Structure formats: C-alpha cells, structure tokens
Amino acid sequence: GHSMSQSNRELVVDFLSYKLSQKGYSWSQFSDVEENRTEAPEGTESEMETPSAINGNPSWHLADSPAVNGATGHSSSLDAREVIPMAAVKQALREAGDEFELRYRRAFSDLTSQLHITPGTAYQSFEQVVNELFRDGVNWGRIVAFFSFGGALCVESVDKEMQVLVSRIAAWMATYLNDHLEPWIQENGGWDTFVELYGNNAAAESRKGQER
C-alpha cells in the first residue's frame, strides 16, 4: 500500500481477474474499469513494523537440513516457493489459488455445498459468501478459501455465458473489502501474516507472532 492504492481492494480483484485470465477471461479484457473509486485516505501501512528483520526464506516446506548451501545467486533461490519481491500479493495468492483452481475444475467442489449458486446472485449471494468469510472475521485459512469461494466460481459462470456472478461477486467483494475489511485485514494481519507465517515456517510459523 502507498496511501490510496488499496492493497486489499486490488488483491481481491487480482485473484478474480487472475483465475479467469487462466483460460476463462471475459470481463478482465472487456472493459477492466468498474470505477477505480477513491474513498477517504488512511494511515500508511508501509511494510509492517520490522522491515529490517525479514530475510532468509525457508528451505521450501519441510525444513530438515543443516542449513548450508551457498546463498550468493538467484539460481539458488529459483522460482520456487521462496521468493521475496515485496509483499507477494500475487505470488502467495497464485499458490493458494492455483491449488484450489485445479481442484475446483471439477465444478462440484465444496463451492456447491457452500453456495450451490443460489438464485439470489444479487446481495443475497454476496451476503452468504461474505458471511462465511466473516464467521471468524479474518482467518488466514478462511480468507484463502473465500478467494476461491467467490473467485473460482466466477470461472464457471463466465463459461456458461452469464456475467451475473463474476460481475456481482467482483463488484460486491471489491465493495465489502473496501467498506471496512481494508483496515481490518492490515490490522488483524490477514493475508499479510498468512504470507509471512506460511512463507517463513523456519522462522517460527505463527509461533512468535505475539511476543515482539
């Protein structure tokens, strides 16, 4: 975030436009300008608190090594799950979204037992999808699933030729996320921590996120 960029109002839309850009795009190229908006300013939220204490990514998943290779080149970091661009608002969402995207390809995932594409595509649908993410407020597990519960489904409707779910969900999510979910995530450490704890298990893995 910078001041009026809205990393949350840009992340939610990025996950949707990304899941569709895979092979189901329809609105992401049509116009891509559903009112950028620009509500009142906010605090700042530059990085977090310790910008000088976030270096040395984990091995990959199951850290089980003497910790000694020769860190001195991007070739040692590769393009695997160990990159540090800045915030990873796309890299982290791409990893969690790719796993649910290929799994939701079945068109019969938990999305149908958690939504079933109710006839109330209006606020009735957005109210249900958001209510499930709001059940815990900002759970690092629910936030990740919600992105696919409202963004992976949008891929199915776009293929059926409707634009009523992707346009409602993308317009509703970007509205609710900006409504009062923007500061709530940056304050409760929503996706921001989800990438740190899941992108730094060797550091602590949600073990020292309440001591410093």
Side-chain angles (χ1 to χ4, degrees):
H2 188 72
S3 156
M4 207 126 78
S5 303
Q6 310 226 289
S7 234
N8 275 308
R9 196 255 298 160
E10 178 173 295
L11 176 274
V12 56
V13 295
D14 269 10
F15 187 91
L16 263 130
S17 64
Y18 181 81
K19 256 61 229 64
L20 281 176
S21 278
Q22 231 278 323
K23 230 159 162 204
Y25 53 76
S26 274
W27 76 264
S28 182
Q29 258 233 53
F30 177 66
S31 286
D32 209 4
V33 282
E34 208 132 68
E35 227 182 43
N36 49 83
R37 255 295 191 79
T38 176
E39 64 144 59
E42 226 186 308
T44 359
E45 315 314 287
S46 30
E47 260 91 84
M48 172 141 115
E49 191 82 314
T50 60
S52 334
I54 310 175
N55 68 293
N57 252 230
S59 246
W60 46 84
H61 189 65
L62 191 83
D64 209 59
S65 15
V68 50
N69 274 29
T72 186
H74 67 275
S75 328
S76 283
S77 295
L78 321 108
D79 294 305
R81 296 151 176 71
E82 59 192 293
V83 291
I84 311 94
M86 171 181 241
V89 72
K90 221 170 148 106
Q91 217 282 338
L93 259 304
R94 173 269 140 165
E95 193 221 257
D98 171 249
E99 250 153 274
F100 290 125
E101 173 248 279
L102 78 94
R103 202 237 190 286
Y104 277 44
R105 206 94 199 199
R106 218 109 155 167
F108 248 90
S109 223
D110 52 6
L111 187 279
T112 53
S113 253
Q114 201 76 294
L115 242 117
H116 214 318
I117 313 306
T118 32
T121 178
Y123 68 82
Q124 246 233 246
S125 172
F126 130 87
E127 173 170 56
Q128 235 73 72
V129 188
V130 175
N131 175 249
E132 214 71 57
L133 169 61
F134 216 80
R135 223 160 155 71
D136 284 33
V138 191
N139 199 351
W140 313 325
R142 301 245 83 78
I143 196 137
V144 180
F146 173 87
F147 290 135
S148 246
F149 286 130
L153 104 80
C154 99
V155 179
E156 314 218 59
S157 11
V158 176
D159 209 355
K160 288 238 153 73
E161 319 203 328
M162 251 103 95
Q163 216 174 124
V164 58
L165 297 186
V166 60
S167 179
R168 285 281 182 281
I169 296 156
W172 272 131
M173 256 155 100
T175 296
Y176 198 87
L177 244 91
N178 170 226
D179 185 64
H180 236 233
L181 237 178
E182 249 260 82
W184 210 232
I185 296 166
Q186 297 274 298
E187 185 169 336
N188 292 73
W191 74 262
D192 199 53
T193 73
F194 172 68
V195 181
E196 246 300 288
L197 57 105
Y198 201 74
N200 214 348
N201 69 323
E205 208 199 302
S206 194
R207 272 236 65 186
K208 310 209 213 117
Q210 203 183 61
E211 214 176 14
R212 300 228 83 171

